[PDB]
Amino acid sequence: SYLVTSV
Amino acid sequence: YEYEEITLERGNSGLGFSIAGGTDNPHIGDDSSIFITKIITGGAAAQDGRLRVNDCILRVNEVDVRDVTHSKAVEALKEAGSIVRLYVKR
């Protein structure tokens, strides 16, 4: 899960 | 698998959760789906109380997100407005 964007 | 619907109102600091996944993101298996990694204390999602870490979002309002890149699912969640229907699988 290299890229984790907070929404 | 369980299938759940969760409606959220957008808060000042957004929906109150984080997503990993997407077709362009590393993962174990055939499983490239968008999923919850964190739910923020006192955020919209935690206040609603239904959403859990590891949830797979299949759909955001009327926009399908089951076969998209990480960026398409981020944009869909950002562009979805003040009231958001999350169709998840746990």
In Å, how far from its chain's centre is CA B56?
A: 7
Measured between alpha carbons, how far is residue B9 from residues A2, B18, B37, B46 in Å?
28, 16, 20, 12
Experimental approach taken: X-ray
- Find out whether B82 and B89 touch, Cβ atoms under 8 Å: no
The ranges assigned to domains in chain B are 1-90
* B36 closest CA partner among B63, B59, B18, B16: B18
Q: Inter-chain contact A1–B15, Cβ cutoff 8 Å?
A: no
Residue position matching structure tokens 């407005």: B81
Q: A5: distance to nearest CA of chain B, Å?
A: 6
Q: Inter-chain contact A7–B18, Cβ cutoff 8 Å?
A: yes
Taking the domain B1-90, which CATH number applies?
Answer: 2.30.42.10
The string of DSSP codes covering chain B is --EEEEEEE-BTTBTSEEEE--TTS--STT----EEEEE-TTSHHHHH----TT-EEEEETTEE-TT--HHHHHHHHHSS-SEEEEEEE-
Tokens of B24: 């362009």
Q: Inter-chain contact B26–A1, Cβ cutoff 8 Å?
A: yes
| Resolution reading in Å | 2.3
Contacts of B89 (CB under 8 A, 6+ apart): B1, B2, B3, B4, B55, B56, B58
Contacts of A4 in chain B (CB under 8 A): 18-20, 37-38
* B51 closest CA partner among B76, B86, B75, B77: B86
Cα–Cα distance for residue pair B52/B37, rounded to 1 Å: 9
